[PDB]
Design a protein around this ligand. Structure first.
Ligand SMILES: O=C(O)CNC(=O)C(=O)O
Ligand SMILES: O=C(O)CNC(=O)C(=O)O
Ligand SMILES: [Fe+3]
Ligand SMILES: [Fe+3]
Lengths: 341, 341
């Protein structure tokens, strides 16, 4: 019942198990499986409408990209610049660079580097070819500069299916598609995003651990003005139960995605994403949409995510009103001690 | 230097000390004196402009009322209804009756009773004449229904002086004049008001203990939606240092006012008001003015009182946004734990 990602699937044509238990990292909390369903299955429509995650196995969303790999993409993607994140651990914490102004004691552990696709490939290879232990993770928004064969792939994505989704759920516009290409073992630690995400897996296998927005009190996000806004403060490999006691009560939903699977990551749901150990490189492309417009009159009882939005806005307005984000904390405490705690 | 109210003053004509040390209650914190100055003294103007308290000894503000007493007021004040607060302790905690909706576990210890001036006097007297231990405190806004001799007194207040003050400080309009008539030993426990107050003493002696708005963290006001909004949770006679640890650090300003003295109580300053033990009944009339309009662009550094206003507004908006004031607390805590504390 806490079966996490379940018994690994069998590759077609008796090519054996897709992955095994030992490619997954070990964590302190339990999880139950995300459902894997066909896009024709009305349970899947039901899950998406209710803003619960579902892995869809047959959308054909990025069918033309399943041939993508490093060689094919070097050949075809253009001479635009790609953002490449760097790290000396498997954990790639990310920084909002605009917020770094306001936190001096904030030297960064994952630096961005702009480079050309060929350079990233070279750099990956002189690491492999020399056995160094650094890690890279290309994360770049698909845009104008990409070459023609890639623009044809893109155009062959299943827009008929995803636009009907966008229409049915009343979401806003497609804000972007992020192209992600990681090394085996890379982790994107637990965070939430404020848009709806269809997360289309292309090459390799990723274990995705999701927590509902109602787990906010177990995951201890950073302050909103901090550069790690929206990321959990808890180190999942070494959790500090003294600072984060409710992380002892956290319960997640997990799954392992491979080529052709699309994971719906609903807005505000926490997600922790790991490229399987010793599984080769991973490729994914996501689809971010603004969420449906927020309705005319509030309907009680509020959803968890709207309480999350409320907290964010309190922190943001208070930061503006005090003229300094560093004063948010002291004031919030003055507000609650001996009054609300 | 912590001399509190100082060596008691001598009544003119060798009528002896106005009051003595033993008419004052004993409390845990230190205090320093509020200055007593003449309204001609430019230090007093300076204090008022800077929103610091000053006792003015010679304004003649309510000179025609110094003849007021129970007999004169029964004779002359009309047949309007007077609010009379009741209590079985010296401590008169007050309730905002509109806020009682939202706190069920809120039976009240000081009930209001409407009555005619003659009834209040009778009621005082059958207590005196029978030696019961209940306490009353008439607190009523001066208005239309008062009789002609009282309206003449009123008209003879020193409007020339107080309107020039109102003009010079850019305050808004006179919102009201509260008439207060207390029994000896009555206490109004520590609270703040959001208007500027000239507090004109008429009969008897009151010890006024003020704390600056920056003592908010030592005085632990009730939640804003509570019926005791703006009052301190701390019982000054039996202070709970485990719930209110910073009450151990509180420092106040004190003074003893008598007939003819006017105490400026600046907006947001905490005040605790006690009618001296065994000093007879007290009479006071206050003058409440809306504070100056809040300036176009905020000027950093903010004043303490503006941080207080900011806290109030957070509590109020959050109560509206959640649809229930009882959820304010839980959410504020969820917001700060493991994030800002
Ligand atoms: O794929 C990853 O490692 C990170 N992806 C996301 O967090 C996302 O798509 O929102
Ligand atoms: O005089 C009292 O006992 C109470 N007065 C006040 O709190 C006031 O004038 O604001
Ligand atoms: Fe994300
Ligand atoms: Fe008051």
């Amino acid at each position: 019942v806490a079966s996490g990602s379940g018994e690994p699937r069998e590759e077609a044509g008796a090519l054996g198990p897709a992955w095994d238990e030992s490619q997954l990292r070990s964590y302190s909390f339990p999880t139950r499986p995300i459902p894997r369903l066909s896009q024709s299955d009305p349970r899947a429509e039901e899950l998406i409408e209710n803003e619960e995650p579902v892995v869809l196995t047959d959308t054909n969303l990025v069918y033309p990209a399943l041939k993508w790999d490093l060689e094919y993409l070097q050949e075809n993607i253009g001479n635009g610049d790609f953002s490449v994140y760097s790290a000396s651990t498997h954990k790639f914490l990310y920084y909002d660079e605009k917020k770094m102004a306001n936190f001096q004691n904030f030297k960064p552990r994952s630096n961005r580097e702009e480079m050309k696709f060929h350079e990233f490939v070279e750099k990956l290879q002189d690491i492999q070819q020399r056995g160094g232990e650094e890690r890279l993770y290309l994360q770049q928004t698909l845009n104008d500069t990409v070459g023609r064969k890639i623009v044809m792939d893109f155009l062959g994505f299943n827009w008929n299916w995803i636009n009907k989704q966008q229409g049915k759920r009343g979401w806003g516009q497609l804000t972007s598609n992020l192209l992600l290409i990681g090394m085996e073992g890379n982790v994107t630690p637990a965070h939430y995003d404020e848009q709806q995400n269809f997360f289309a897996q292309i090459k390799g296998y990723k274990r995705c651990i999701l927590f509902p927005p109602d787990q906010f009190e177990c995951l201890y996000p950073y302050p909103v003005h901090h550069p790690c806004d929206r990321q959990s403060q808890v180190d999942f490999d070494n959790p500090d139960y003294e600072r984060f006691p409710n992380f002892q009560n956290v319960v997640g939903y997990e799954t392992v995605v491979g080529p052709g699977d699309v994971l719906y990551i609903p807005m505000y749901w926490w997600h922790h994403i790991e490229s399987l150990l010793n599984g080769g490189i991973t490729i994914t492309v996501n689809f971010w949409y603004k969420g449906a417009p927020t309705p005319k009159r509030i309907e009680y009882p509020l959803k968890a995510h709207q309480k999350v939005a409320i907290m964010r806005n309190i922190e943001k307005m208070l930061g503006e009103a005090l003229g300094n984000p560093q004063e948010v904390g002291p004031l919030l405490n003055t507000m609650i001690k001996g009054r609300y705690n």
